[PDB]
């Protein structure tokens, strides 16, 4: 059933000052191209005016317009296609200005 998802580039942790833009970034491959999601605490996140998920081919991102302390924690990038699933977690640390 095609080729299962994998990471060409793995999402590294982000350490960011409160108020700064933060982005988690990866490059996922697979055939068909995997659907990617970002989750936090096992919940799928929703796009908003401060949180977006820019996707461009294999590049997927989790973009925070202006980080806040409550954004800190572990995020999970979950890729799926017909042949399988791939998972990578990354932590956001938010520092005081």
């Amino acid at each position: 059933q095609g080729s299962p998802p994998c990471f060409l580039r793995f999402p590294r942790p982000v350490r960011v000052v409160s108020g700064a833009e933060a982005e988690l970034k990866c490059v996922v491959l697979g055939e068909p191209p995997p659907v990617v999601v970002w989750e936090k605490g096992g919940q799928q996140l929703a796009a908003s005016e401060r949180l977006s998920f820019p996707a461009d081919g294999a590049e997927h991102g989790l973009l925070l317009t202006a980080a806040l302390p409550t954004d800190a924690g572990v995020y999970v990038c979950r890729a799926r296609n017909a042949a399988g699933e791939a998972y990578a977690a990354a932590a956001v640390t938010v520092l005081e200005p």
């Binding site: 299962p4 793995f10 942790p13 572990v74 399988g84 699933e85 998972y87 990578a88 990354a90």
Partner: protein, 99 residues
Amino acid sequence: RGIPPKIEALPSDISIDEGKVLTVACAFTGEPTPEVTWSCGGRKIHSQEQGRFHIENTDDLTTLIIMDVQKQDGGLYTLSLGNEFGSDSATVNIHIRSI
């Protein structure tokens, strides 16, 4: 130079349908580069265990790949790191769906 190992983030829970391929990747740090051990049920996972498990490590990433996932592959997996200066451990609970 003496820095103990650190497992970056690891999901706490992951899921896969029976018969598919599961990949979980995890970054780490440490100086010297740590020894990497994956286990479930208190038993080390070896390369080509059951002809289906694989572990691909680099100097800062470990990737566990389970091919043709089977119902018995479920459970609480532990990733451990050790070097001369300390150790770290984290768990991922791998859930096999019959659906």
